[PDB]
Amino acid sequence: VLKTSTLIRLVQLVVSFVSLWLTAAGFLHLLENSGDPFFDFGNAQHLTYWECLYFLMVTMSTVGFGDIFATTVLGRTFVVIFIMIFIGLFASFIPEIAEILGKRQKYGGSYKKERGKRHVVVCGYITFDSVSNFLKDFLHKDREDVDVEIVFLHKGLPGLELEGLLKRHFTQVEYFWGSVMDANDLERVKIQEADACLVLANKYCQDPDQEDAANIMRVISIKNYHSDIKVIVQLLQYHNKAYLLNIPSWDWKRGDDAVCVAELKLGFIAQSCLAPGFSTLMANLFTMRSYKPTPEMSQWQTDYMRGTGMEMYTEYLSSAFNALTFPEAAELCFSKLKLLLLAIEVRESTLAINPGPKVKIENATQGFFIAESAEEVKRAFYYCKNCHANVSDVRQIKKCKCRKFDSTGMFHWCPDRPLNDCLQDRSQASASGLRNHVVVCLFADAASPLIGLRNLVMPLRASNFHYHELKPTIIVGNLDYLHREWKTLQNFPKLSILPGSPLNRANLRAVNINLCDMCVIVSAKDRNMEDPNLVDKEAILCSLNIKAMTFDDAGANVPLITELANDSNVQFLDQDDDDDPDTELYMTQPFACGTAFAVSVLDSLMSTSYFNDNALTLIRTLITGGATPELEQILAEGAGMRGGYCSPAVLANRDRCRVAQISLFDGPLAQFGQGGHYGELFVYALRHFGILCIGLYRFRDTNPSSKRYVITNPPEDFPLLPTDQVYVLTYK
């Protein structure tokens, strides 16, 4: 009848205790009532058997009321023996029962599904920090208020902070014990009926390979249980993404997005090398924020914090936009509705970013907007040319009543090379007249794991750029490390590797870091293996070393961007600002100016991949420079990049929209920088050139350090300066 060690130990504990307690009671019942032969059976207090149980449990527990006591000689000698023994039983009896009856797992049961409500199964790394970041993005005021429950399936029992968070979000969120590997725990959660499944990941760990290996197995166990299901995964290393693409059930078509952190992280940084500060333009568009201007802030901060409140949104355009060109449509969204229209999905649904006048708007077209909230974008859905054409107040539109190339033709390809062709010393690097280029200051041991600098270099070598226009990249690190990554990196032109650490000024002066477009600082070393303060020692010391240097033909004017493991270590980068660890990473001066880029800002990207399936694949076109699924399956087949010369049909895919900065100092746009506003600039640039002004990169000090800060989609009436730089989607 008894199975498991707990129930056998429990029954042994209870029954042995009860039997011995009952016998001892009866032994006193004998001795007390009989008396003793020492005094001719004279002394004999008349206790019942039931009075002796009360007496013994009391003396066993070491309470000892003295309400009943032993008068007899033989009885008292038994009490002395009883006291020595049964205190020993009672001391181990109750605590061991408490351990056995405490082991019942609390958050068991099973998720009972309601009819109309659809739900999501979150799993993997689930702590207070991972969930609190997730629930702020997923459950938020700005999104369309859809009834979507969340179900946290997890092995461990939750902490006291997490329990409080789960109780505050009572109606939506529910927590459940058990792993994703057991098929019984999936029938429990009802993942078959569920909409999607989100595998979160521990970014800060001992090694990333064991973490992703678990998350890959989590996917396999879900797909083994049921094939037709959306599974979104948070991976860390890019080479681990090849394993998910070779699972047969894993289908790209139905929205199985592997949110690879290293692909995006370096991609965001790579686009900053082309147009500085773009790293923190895009990072703010995906964290769901709201504008709360406190009076302590200065002029530059309040304009930045408005930019944080803008986000990506998908919503259908009204019938007013039908039979109408793109630039005229994007103008109506900006001028009247006050919404920045980026892209329109055209019915295989192609995702065209900022097309010219040829691409018309069909009926029921999904438009991609940058706006303050989802309900603000809903003004596009309720627009009418007959009714709303004379209304200046925009809140009144609530009325519903109306050379070598890759096989894909996306990147600049090369034939395979050995490392010694692209290797350089301090003599050869200084001989090469390097200017307007990228410098990857790479910190790594020989044994340290791969980042995939391939993901940094790839978007720099996009087919949008001509061969002469490409910014020549110089990586600075170990040969032992880069010998691994050379397998992937070999098929990229204008790439140069220089050995030694980038802390040495002799290395940097040979590179000409003073004449650098963007010096990217990366650390491949193990993240959190010792302390939180000593993690970004190399990353901070390299940035401070470059700021401190002076050149003689430009010290602090060297533009650089630092990857960070810790968010709190952002304060040590810049030397002139107010620092508080209470203040979040996005509000800090180094981040706002595109000098820093932590990984933590991409926690929100797991939520957006669920809600807006196309919003994730939008930015992969805009960031990596056309990383098509076609490429991912070619790379999964294992022979690296390939191509040749290619046909003119394939090479007509060089035309897509890259990001670029336009300074308002020279050229035709300079007239607007003197006196006029941002709204006047946007309309003039759109008609003539085919340009969508996303935001500004304005100087912090204007009254002098050269630190510029991001302003994503400012108001219509926002004054410009002649020193400003404007982010733009081009057709050049």
Partner 1 sequence: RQWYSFLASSLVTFGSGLVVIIIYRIVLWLCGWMTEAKDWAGELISGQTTTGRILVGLVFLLSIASLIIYFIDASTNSSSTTQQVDLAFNVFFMIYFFIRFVAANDKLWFWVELFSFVDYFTIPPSFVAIYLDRNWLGLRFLRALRLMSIPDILTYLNVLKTSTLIRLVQLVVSFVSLWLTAAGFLHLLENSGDPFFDFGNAQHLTYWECLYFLMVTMSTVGFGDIFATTVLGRTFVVIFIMIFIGLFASFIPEIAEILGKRQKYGGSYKKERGKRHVVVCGYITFDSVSNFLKDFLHKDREDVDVEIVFLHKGLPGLELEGLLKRHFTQVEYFWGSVMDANDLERVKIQEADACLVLANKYCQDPDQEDAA
Binding residues for Mg(2+): 114, 149, 174
User: Is 71 a binder of K ion (CB under 5 A)?
Assistant: no
Kindly indicate which of the ranges 153-161, 206-214, 277-285, 507-515 contains the residues binding partner 1, using the contact rule CB under 8 A. Answer: 153-161
Cα–Cα distance, 262 to 269 (Å, whole number): 11
Residue 268's contacts (CB-CB under 8 Å, 6 or more residues apart) are 278, 279, 282, 283, 597, 623
User: Is 66 a binder of K ion (CB under 5 A)?
Assistant: yes
| Of 621, 629, 143, 177, residue with least CA distance to 371 | 143
User: Is 531 a binder of partner 1 (CB under 8 A)?
Assistant: yes
The binder of Ca ion chosen from 212, 372, 485, 603 (CB under 5 A): 372
Cα–Cα distance, 342 to 310 (Å, whole number): 13
User: Is 142 a binder of Ca ion (CB under 5 A)?
Assistant: yes
User: Is 468 a binder of partner 1 (CB under 8 A)?
Assistant: no
Minimum distance, C-beta of residue 558 to partner 1, in the bound complex (Å): 24
Instruction: Pick the closer one to partner 1 by CB: 192 or 533.
Output: 533
Return the ∠ at Cα 49 (arms to 45 and 54), rounded to 5°: 95
Query: The tokens 């040969």 sit on which residue?
Result: 479
The binder of partner 1 chosen from 7, 8, 117, 467 (CB under 8 A): 117
Number of other CB atoms surrounding residue 449 within 10 Å: 19
User: Is 64 a binder of K ion (CB under 5 A)?
Assistant: yes
Return the ∠ at Cα 164 (arms to 161 and 167), rounded to 5°: 150
Kindly indicate which of the ranges 59-67, 147-155, 547-555, 576-584 contains the residues binding K ion, using the contact rule CB under 5 A. Answer: 59-67
Kindly indicate which of the ranges 109-117, 251-259, 318-326, 724-732 contains the residues binding partner 1, using the contact rule CB under 8 A. Answer: 109-117
Instruction: Pick the closer one to partner 1 by CB: 581 or 629.
Output: 581
HSE-CB of 33 using CA atoms within 13 angstroms: 12
User: Is 348 a binder of partner 1 (CB under 8 A)?
Assistant: no
Residue 667 binds what, of Ca ion, partner 1, K ion, none (CB under 5 to 8 Å, by partner type)?
Answer: none
Minimum distance, C-beta of residue 280 to Ca ion, in the bound complex (Å): 16
Tokens of 257: 């997005």
> Do 209 and 449 meet the contact criterion of CB atoms below 8 Å apart?
yes
Q: What is the separation, in whole angstroms, between the first and last Cα of the chain?
A: 79
User: Is 364 a binder of partner 1 (CB under 8 A)?
Assistant: no
User: Is 715 a binder of partner 1 (CB under 8 A)?
Assistant: no
Residue 533 binds what, of partner 1, K ion, Ca ion, none (CB under 5 to 8 Å, by partner type)?
Answer: partner 1
Tokens of 26: 């009866």
User: Is 469 a binder of partner 1 (CB under 8 A)?
Assistant: no
* Kind plus residue range of the DSSP H or E element containing 134: helix 128-138
Tokens of 666: 């020279």
Residue 134's contacts (CB-CB under 8 Å, 6 or more residues apart) are 122, 200, 603, 606, 607
User: Is 576 a binder of partner 1 (CB under 8 A)?
Assistant: no
> Do 18 and 10 meet the contact criterion of CB atoms below 8 Å apart?
no
Number of residues that bind K ion (CB under 5 A): 3
Question: Inter-axis angle of helices 678-689 and 326-335, to 10 degrees?
Answer: 170
Residue 372 binds what, of Ca ion, partner 1, K ion, none (CB under 5 to 8 Å, by partner type)?
Answer: Ca ion
Residue 115 binds what, of partner 1, K ion, Ca ion, none (CB under 5 to 8 Å, by partner type)?
Answer: partner 1
| Of 372, 389, 394, 368, residue with least CA distance to 316 | 368
Minimum distance, C-beta of residue 449 to partner 1, in the bound complex (Å): 21
User: Is 536 a binder of Ca ion (CB under 5 A)?
Assistant: no
Residue 94 binds what, of Ca ion, K ion, partner 1, none (CB under 5 to 8 Å, by partner type)?
Answer: partner 1
| Of 409, 294, 371, residue with least CA distance to 713 | 371
User: Is 164 a binder of K ion (CB under 5 A)?
Assistant: no
Cα–Cα distance, 465 to 443 (Å, whole number): 29
The binder of partner 1 chosen from 3, 40, 67, 427 (CB under 8 A): 67
Tokens of 275: 């147009």
Instruction: Pick the closer one to K ion by CB: 58 or 139.
Output: 58
**Which residue ranges make up the annotated binding site for Ca(2+)?**
142, 224, 289, 309, 311, 372, 571, 574, 577, 579
User: Is 171 a binder of partner 1 (CB under 8 A)?
Assistant: yes
Minimum distance, C-beta of residue 58 to K ion, in the bound complex (Å): 9
- Please give the single-letter amino acid code of residue 658: R
Minimum distance, C-beta of residue 161 to partner 1, in the bound complex (Å): 6
Instruction: Pick the closer one to K ion by CB: 64 or 88.
Output: 64
Instruction: Pick the closer one to partner 1 by CB: 116 or 415.
Output: 116
Listing DSSP states for 218-270 in one string gives: HHHHHHHH-SSSEEEEEESSSTTHHHHHTSSS--TTTT--EEEHHHHHHHHHH
User: Is 309 a binder of Ca ion (CB under 5 A)?
Assistant: yes
Cα–Cα distance, 416 to 424 (Å, whole number): 18
Return the ∠ at Cα 36 (arms to 35 and 42), rounded to 5°: 60
User: Is 104 a binder of partner 1 (CB under 8 A)?
Assistant: no
Cα–Cα distance, 555 to 573 (Å, whole number): 15
The binder of K ion chosen from 19, 62, 224, 702 (CB under 5 A): 62
**Which residue ranges make up the annotated binding site?**
114, 142, 149, 174, 224, 289, 309, 311, 372, 571, 574, 577, 579
Q: Where are the alpha helices (DSSP H) in 625-712?
A: 629-636, 648-651, 670-674, 678-689
> Do 176 and 108 meet the contact criterion of CB atoms below 8 Å apart?
yes
The residues that touch Ca ion, with contacts defined as CB under 5 A, are 142, 290, 309, 372, 571, 574, 577, 579
The residues that touch partner 1, with contacts defined as CB under 8 A, are 50, 53-54, 57-58, 61-67, 94-95, 98, 112, 114-117, 147, 159-161, 163-164, 167-171, 530-531, 533-534, 537, 571, 579-581
The residues that touch K ion, with contacts defined as CB under 5 A, are 62, 64, 66
